[model samples]
Target: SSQGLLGYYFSDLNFQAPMVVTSSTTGDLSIPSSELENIPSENQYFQSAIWSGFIKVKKSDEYTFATSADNHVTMWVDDQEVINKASNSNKIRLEKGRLYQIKIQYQRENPTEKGLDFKLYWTDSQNKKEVISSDNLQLPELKQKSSNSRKKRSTSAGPTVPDRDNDGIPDSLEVEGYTVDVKNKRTFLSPWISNIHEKKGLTKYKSSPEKWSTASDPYSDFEKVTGRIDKNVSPEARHPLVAAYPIVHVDMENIILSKNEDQSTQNTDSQTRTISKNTSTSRTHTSEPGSNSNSSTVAIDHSLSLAGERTWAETMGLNTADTARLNANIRYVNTGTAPIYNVLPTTSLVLGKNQTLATIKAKENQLSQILAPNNYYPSKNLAPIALNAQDDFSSTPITMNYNQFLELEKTKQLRLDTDQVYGNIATYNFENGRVRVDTGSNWSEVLPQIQETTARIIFNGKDLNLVERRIAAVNPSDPLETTKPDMTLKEALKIAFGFNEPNGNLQYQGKDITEFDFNFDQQTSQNIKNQLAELNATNIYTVLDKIKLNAKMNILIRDKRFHYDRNNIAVGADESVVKEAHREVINSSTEGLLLNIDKDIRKILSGYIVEIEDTEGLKEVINDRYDMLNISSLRQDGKTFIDFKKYNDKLPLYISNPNYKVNVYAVTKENTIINPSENGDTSTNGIKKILIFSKKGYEIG
Candidate 1:
């Protein structure tokens, strides 16, 4: 319920009472001269103001913060003074889903007559500068809830009574601990609570608004807890619980028993089965914030044939009195029409022993929705895929199936748009009638690694070998022209080593390729001679070999070759400068032949070969539009679990055009896993390296 920051305005410099207070959603206080009348300024000429709230980070990373203000200003995060008028930037390490206290103080100098201004900026591991806006800022209710309750509980003299829900049962008694097998029926020492109290069905609880406070009435809402169980008399019985704490929520599978369930005497099978279901359910609970308290029910079917005469007491081997007590405990009546014999219920539980509930509320507040000002344009569309150091382009296009696009379009999670210049090639926009996805800043750091992996895949001769195999299978006299060399020696040399070639002047000519003798043309030879003079190298080959792996070569290639003006000038087409067109779109398909060589030859030959993925295949370019990519985080078992909730049950649709095709890939330093269906279900260490590749428009049906 808490939405924004509270602001206080002062007339005098020192700060006095009778001040005007206001609330702001946008964390920016950089009020311009024209817009000065809109703010709560007592004296427009000279005034002081303070803004206070909690700021949340989307990912755990080292962050650098900055401020731009007129006259004087000071700011703090988590109560530490970090930025001031004089300080350009300050560094701090921040974790995802943790709220840090933020306060900004500003004053306008009386002598000078300039506009009032204040802006908070930050750059995370992603290395992109962005203003500390509404997304990261929130009201302090959640922070207070965590801090106030935790501090009060820890300060107690003895271990506080561990009860979260006020239903009177100790939180420990909410689930079964150790059950002993008694003649096939499972039995345990029931935590005896007086008949006066009864367990309540799990129901929906509203998230904390301004009215609710946990310190005074903590029992009403589900409370999170963790501890060890000690009591049983055997050393083997003292086995510790796995670190993932299954606390405070209702476990549907454990409470409702399926008839004919206990096949073995050991509770071991039941324990394993129950524990397994928790992994998935906990994942669901963690990702879906605020829904943890809601009731989760299993669907019952009446289609099964009725069973003969066995009653409930007989199933549990309970005496008449004990059976009545069990019936009283599970008070709700069974609604199904037929008394079916065997019931199989699918259980998906997240037994989060290693994890904590701290992840829930922060993400709940962080995932809080903020719609774009305009549905046509996304507020956070920064092109999810950036050109890594390997690629010369900013972003590449991706394609998707028309059916998938239609399914996604219905949800409006994404929208199909087109570049005014390249109208035929559909472009995608994110946060279109939907809140932006927070993939966290971690993926930003992983992007380069993904690009390198992609480059390694296309250029490491595996795909090339496949291409060669395909060509070799064709007849010499076929339309594909298999017997002839795929590319000319001159063209291959130029692609591998050519730079700053303005005219049709050649570097190494066709005549220079006789036998083992290798040479360059006079102008190109002189260019290499000049380059050698700067580096004090003996020959052209020596300079070429040295520059291949050197840091200076990376700098030259990154800062010089990819230089905007030069790169655009070199590209003779009408494609965008921002999104460097795919290599196949820029060059003839035969240029892919340059990537087929082995490392021994490629090392010396790849002196100027930057951006490998583009030249590999026309259909394999990755999408670069819309930063709100619908990628899930990698789980412990190496699967990226997809939860299509906030997106209104739709995958990211705008990534493809109606006529194109797209595939999802999760790349790591070691390997790459492609999800052919693009459902984002891929086995990988994590989703740090997710890229979407599109089919070439002309090639698709």
Candidate 2:
């Protein structure tokens, strides 16, 4: 990646400048940085930002590109729209060993509001998703390479491959930017490489956190760092009316004081509101350092509360758009609402907290039980609700609901007392009683995260362009709706190691992405990349051809099929090889080595144990070699196999070479060896095999 990439932001959507946002917003703003940081969250309406750079695509296949923005956003790859977001997910067919000019444009449309959060996601063919992943991404600072420095290998005479590293191999057969010398060999490593040997000095790039930050302006993306306003949902564009006032949220103390005293207060950021029966005036206390420790003094009356008030009209099938309907006539507030039996079973809030108290309640209410700290549910759902309130109000299951405000009489105002005591979220103080919630964070305060679901669309699972079946399955966000883009050859190799090992996910994203697969000498296993590169798979469908049109692997090597030697039938030559198990030699030989030869050890110590499927056949045969790097490797003739053995289910056979490359032959009627491809798949006397990297899986000699 380069350092010269420039990011610019404009005060207007026109983005023409006298660019005010530039220079300091280094790296790809959508990836490592953003120009919005320079511009405050306020007065950013109609403002737009763009990041330009020559991006490098390490893999070759269709890629899914998307971004979440407030007003508008667009991205161009190789001169065309790769992420014309408003149109739905844009899946671009990218090529391996290539680069595309990337342009990211973001804008803040409401000057009245504040914020500038931006992010993007790129999914490759492997079903893996990322937001400007560095592995498949590059920000080449050299805006343009000098023609004078150009060392063209092809003299325009047809075309010829370039091999600068001079490893007696053409560069065409290798991914670019490997830092090959004039002698052409990869050694050292890229400053941005993922190594599993716990390689001394490399670290994974940053990734999205489990908890997102508060959205500053109105723009939001996958990072959840900021939230974008859904202009269409106009009613919610303004601040929530509850606590959004200059003074305290209605005088809960004064109203209660008319009947009692002794209350408390809650403070945050720059504002403090205290609820107290102040006979004279309110006490202006400085930030009560540990003062947040004071007990909640507010009181509440739970006698007026009822579980049946839980029916917030919305549950009775009434249109919430009618504001007049949610009247003070409601006897009980849907306050003590609880999602009990028959609610949504799998729902987190359906019966699990799903319904809604319509407002312009367009906001996801899931019709939660509305109640103050004064009220608490014991059996909660285990208690009951007015099941089919009209059918039977008797024994009608009722726990809690928020019908009070609407059910009350002469109700001029309604306020949600978010009266929380610091260090204890489960504690609440209302008008008459202090209630303890069943569970809550023991935190004094938590950062508020506003996640607004913006883009909600689905695509064909098999083909991005395929317009078929098309189920209108839109209920909520389905993580399953996807067809990943393509990944580079190097990506698959790293993935193989992590696919099964604990923490084996060699994530290029952060510390988590690194895989212990760094277990092997990369240079050796790395050779596979060059080999795959030579095959050059063009489409997601042809990715296998790019894998091993040449090298035949022993790990999953069958008649073009890779599987566990599930059946340790030592028929042919292996019969002469009888040995026992020894799990100790492995622990003694190397500190981190993961390999074996139990039969040899058994023969050496326990004696010849001619094992059948009894050791490594059918299901339990090849648990040992389950960690096949690139199960996607060794594919061919519309045929490819995976040694999908559960961990520790594989049997091991030690060969002279440990590279994992192997060959399989179709033993004829005479029990001879004749390896076939797109030619034959018959083995009367069973198959003959050997583990050795083959230029074409053949002996060569």
Candidate 3:
């Protein structure tokens, strides 16, 4: 019942072919590879690697097909394409019980990189079916054949018992007639017994008068009339007339057996009805005879043939009720003093210990001490009372039933109170009640202050509902209050400036300003200063003064380490203008100053020139001519302002002309020299500057 059978089976297969292209720019690529192979590495050209494969299923209807591919794929099973072109697809259906000839093609292109591969697998209808295949078939015929062959071989070789019901009793013995069901399967005997004689190891029934006439009876060998009576009865009579019949004699007395077979049959019908009702309604009831029941009660005079009648009462040796009465009388006897007086022996006392009366009295007294004080009766007589000498000690009343002692012990009363009580004292002096008194004083006075302080700190400004209402009633404004001002940049600057200089100009400039000059006339400066002084005398100045005083106090506390120096002055310059001007000066001065100096020096050097006579007119010449001719000689000759035209013919006018010569000299190389006509042959034994002129009088050479 606790075990059962389980079974399972399935199958799947997949095949594919892929094609790919290889390029010199990329890596190697090949076909006839696994579905996970033959991928193009040339990502720059196609932007993806492509792998293509084909699948063919022979029988499409034999199984359902499921396909999973990483990239784009197309699957066709027979003419009915199970899966169309799909990307990263799975789970396609196939016709049941038919082989699928599938043509699966997949191309995975690496859109960004190279090397692409994917797996392809399909489950067919045959694989999905729970029915077992012919190759794996486990036929019932084969199992039967195998089991039958094993059974035949085992039976022929030895005594192989087959317990069809698996009840351990052999099949041969379970059949009726060999032994009645009641005697064969007795409740008192083990179910494992194959034969009663075998179980008791008795060969045959003994011939003694006490032995049962039949060996089949459970009490057959018992030395009792009941055993003989049961064994002597017919096998049919051995079983109870009803299922409810008891096995033991004492229990049998509680049940009334049916007198006739008809009544027995009626009882059986009622039992069957009870069983049926139990099954139908899941309930049970004790059976009683019907008012008009056709049940018959007839005496069954079954007497043993030569052996004796073997009724259950007879088998148990309890034919008469007197024996039972005697047993009951023996079981319950009166051992109390009232009954003991009528039964006790009057002669020699049976003290059980064989002690004298005096000794017995002492012993009883000693036992009395062992009993609870309340349970002991000190005045009670110790000597035994008169009683009938024939009374059996076995018939004596039990002092306490097994459960009575347990109940008494469980319900015993307990003593709980102490033995003494003391009077209460209202008050006692330390000397009189020294052990219970002390001189220590209570510290309860400090608790309220501590608790109040803690409560205030924790709950202050916290807007709990009840607390807030209470607080509002006591003081309407916020519970926690302070006087502090919000500080700002403008306020700070106003106060600082006022404190630094009581009267001074503090202007806020606009964004655009070509210049900012701090210079002022003395009166205007003094007036501005005085205005600042007046402003500082106001409330703002008062706050600043307080700040200064506080700062001084701090310094004093720190041993003057942070003292302020009054002599230190702060220039209230326009910071924005100053920053801009500083940057502009730094940028312009370096390049501008260098260029101006070069220009001025060039003009001053170029201004030192002299005038000379040319063919056209008087022209300025370089002063080097005066130095070369010696100015003293020229002055001695009384030619203070010699006309350049007077010396033009002799001077070779172009040479004396400053414009021509200077221009020529400016154009000439550093080492070049010019010679005049006066020293033409020997180069005048000195170098001379020359100016060239063109034939057209353009002054070229």
Best candidate (score: TM-score): 1
Candidate 1, residues 7-96, lDDT tens digits: the string is 544545654421233334555644344533322333444366666656777789888877666237777766576766666545799988
Among these predictions, the greatest lDDT belongs to 1
Q: lDDT values of the candidates?
A: 0.28, 0.26, 0.20
lDDT of 2 by residue, 184-214 (tens): 1101111122342134322221111111111
Show where candidate 1 strays beyond 4 Å. 17-19, 30-42, 111-115, 142-701
Between prediction 2 and prediction 3, which has the larger lDDT? 2
TM-score-best of 1 and 3: 1
Candidate 1 lDDT at 563 equals: 15
- Tens digits of per-residue lDDT, candidate 3, 1-701, equal 10000000001011111112211101112211222111222311122222111122334443333334423445453345455554422445443333323233444433332333233344444455332122211111101112321111111221123323221122332231111111211111111223443344321111112112111111222111111121222222222110000010000001111111223234433321100000000001111211101111111111111132233333323322211110110001111001110111111111112311110112211222111111112213332221211454533221222233222223211111111111111111111111111122111222222122110100101111000000000111323211112222222222211112223333222111111122223432353345457656533223322221100000000011111111111111122322222221111110011011111112111111123345565444423331122111123332222122222333433443323322211111111222223433312123332222112223323
Global lDDT for candidate 2?
A: 0.26
Error of 3 at 622 (Å): 99
Q: TM per model? A: 0.22, 0.20, 0.12
From the highest TM-score down, the ranking of the candidates is: 1, 2, 3
The per-prediction CA RMSD against the true structure, in angstroms, equals 33.7, 31.6, 65.9
